[PDB]
Amino acid sequence: DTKIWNGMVGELVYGKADIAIAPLTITLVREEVIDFSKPFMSLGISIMIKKPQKS
Amino acid sequence: DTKIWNGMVGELVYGKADIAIAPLTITLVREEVIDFSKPFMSLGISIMIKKPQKS
Structure with missing residues (x-):
């Protein structure tokens, strides 16, 4: 919607x-x-x- | 010795x-x-x- 990067990329793109x-x-x-x-x-x-065991 | 790239890299570095x-x-x-x-x-x-043999 806003086309704004959140997260770490929004911290990298926006100089944060x-x-x-x-x-x-x-x-x-x-x-x-x-x-x-x-x-x-x-x-x-x-x-x-699951690791299997003895069916 | 010559520190010259052979091969494909020598074709890429030297413009070939x-x-x-x-x-x-x-x-x-x-x-x-x-x-x-x-x-x-x-x-x-x-x-x-070797794949396990069928003998």
Whole structure:
């Protein structure tokens, strides 16, 4: 609605913060306003299930 | 010895090539001379063993 970044990006875009060292997912629209470094931690959606025991 | 980049980077640094779309591992010393994009394919060292035989 306002197209105003909240959160850490709103602290980075609006001069409130100097840098971010945080679990920030690199997306397209986030690089449109700030600059990421290269990723330090690759990840993806994973399947958490119960550890099974003796059906 | 010569500190001359061979390969695709030597084609990119020395103006021979315009861009690289190739399996190029992003390292520190490679970014010291050219600019990578964000990685399109995360990977790592994997363990190839024999598939369990059907004997």
